[PDB]
Design an enzyme around this catalytic site. Sequence first.
Site, PDB file in Angstrom:
ATOM      1  N   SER A  43       0.785  -1.222   0.000  1.00 13.07           N
ATOM      2  CA  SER A  43       0.000   0.000   0.000  1.00 13.07           C
ATOM      3  C   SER A  43       0.823   1.281   0.000  1.00 13.07           C
ATOM      4  CB  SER A  43      -0.994   0.041   1.161  1.00 13.07           C
ATOM      5  OG  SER A  43      -2.144  -0.709   0.900  1.00 13.07           O
ATOM      6  N   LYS A  46      -0.128   3.808  -2.612  1.00  3.75           N
ATOM      7  CA  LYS A  46      -1.330   4.603  -2.557  1.00  3.75           C
ATOM      8  C   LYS A  46      -1.005   6.098  -2.478  1.00  3.75           C
ATOM      9  CE  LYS A  46      -4.815   1.572  -0.331  1.00  3.75           C
ATOM     10  NZ  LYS A  46      -4.331   0.212  -0.565  1.00  3.75           N
ATOM     11  N   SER A 101      -5.766   3.108   4.392  1.00  6.76           N
ATOM     12  CA  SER A 101      -5.302   2.024   3.524  1.00  6.76           C
ATOM     13  C   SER A 101      -6.467   1.185   3.002  1.00  6.76           C
ATOM     14  CB  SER A 101      -4.199   1.177   4.159  1.00  6.76           C
ATOM     15  OG  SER A 101      -3.285   0.823   3.134  1.00  6.76           O
ATOM     16  N   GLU A 137      -5.631  -4.051  -6.315  1.00  7.35           N
ATOM     17  CA  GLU A 137      -5.803  -4.708  -5.025  1.00  7.35           C
ATOM     18  C   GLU A 137      -6.786  -5.872  -5.161  1.00  7.35           C
ATOM     19  OE1 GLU A 137      -4.179  -3.991  -2.465  1.00  7.35           O
ATOM     20  OE2 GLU A 137      -3.616  -1.845  -2.612  1.00  7.35           O
ATOM     21  N   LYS A 205       3.072   6.713   4.680  1.00 11.04           N
ATOM     22  CA  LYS A 205       2.148   5.722   4.177  1.00 11.04           C
ATOM     23  C   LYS A 205       2.764   4.341   4.373  1.00 11.04           C
ATOM     24  CE  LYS A 205      -1.506   3.886   2.467  1.00 11.04           C
ATOM     25  NZ  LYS A 205      -1.276   2.835   3.511  1.00 11.04           N
ATOM     26  N   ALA A 208       1.730  -3.462   3.730  1.00  9.46           N
ATOM     27  CA  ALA A 208       1.759  -4.809   4.272  1.00  9.46           C
ATOM     28  C   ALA A 208       1.393  -5.763   3.143  1.00  9.46           C
ATOM     29  CB  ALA A 208       0.727  -4.952   5.399  1.00  9.46           C
TER      30      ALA A 208
END
Length: 263
Positions: A43, A46, A101, A137, A205, A208
């Site tokens: 992430s 992002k 997230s 995602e 940010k 994981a």
Amino acid sequence: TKSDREFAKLEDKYDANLGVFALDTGTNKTVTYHPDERFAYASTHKALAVGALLQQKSIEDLNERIFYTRDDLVNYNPITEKHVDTGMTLRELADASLRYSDNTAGNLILQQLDGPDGFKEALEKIGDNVTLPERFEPDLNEVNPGETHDTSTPRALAASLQKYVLGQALPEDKRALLTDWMKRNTTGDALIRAGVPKSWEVADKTGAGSYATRNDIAILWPPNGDPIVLAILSNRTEKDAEYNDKLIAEAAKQAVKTLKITR
């Protein structure tokens, strides 16, 4: 080097593999450890995707309400599940992506960018020839060793974050929106924030992913100093291994300690 030995001790302590890039933006001095090794970005991307969205939209355009369905929901939808029957504005989606997230929000933002491929083009336009978006995602979070889809390096993630938050990739007003969202992140308190002095402001940010991928990218503002860019990426041997946030906090503490030496 001696700094390398300290990062290697953290790798041993946490049975993990580290990638570090830190830059003092006042002097251009750095700290590196596996800085050009690829990791799944998870992430952390992002933040860069919101930077790219801001390049493509006026601030008033962020009021556009995006409608989506239950079929758009993926595996982690803390904000978006609550709004499937209402829509969310682009501003709200950026907030959810960066501060929570939220993976559906992240995908909706990728769709605004014409998917991973359009996001990659936006990164190439700021001079990032390293970060390689390919998937949405949640699949982007699983990268087997040696694959390059959905990977970047500590150095490149730091460079791209710097361009958006501190450099000239955005006008000042949009830059301030991005900075504010990242400063007010809810997910990063145990990572870089836990390893740097409490007096410093932090915009971060987290990420994981599979192979215990555990990442944090940040801009740091010491009260009496120049901003610092810091990217810390990590992974472990087993696909299903569990990460330890303390690795990232301790690596951040070491990066600060090493940067101090030559300032």
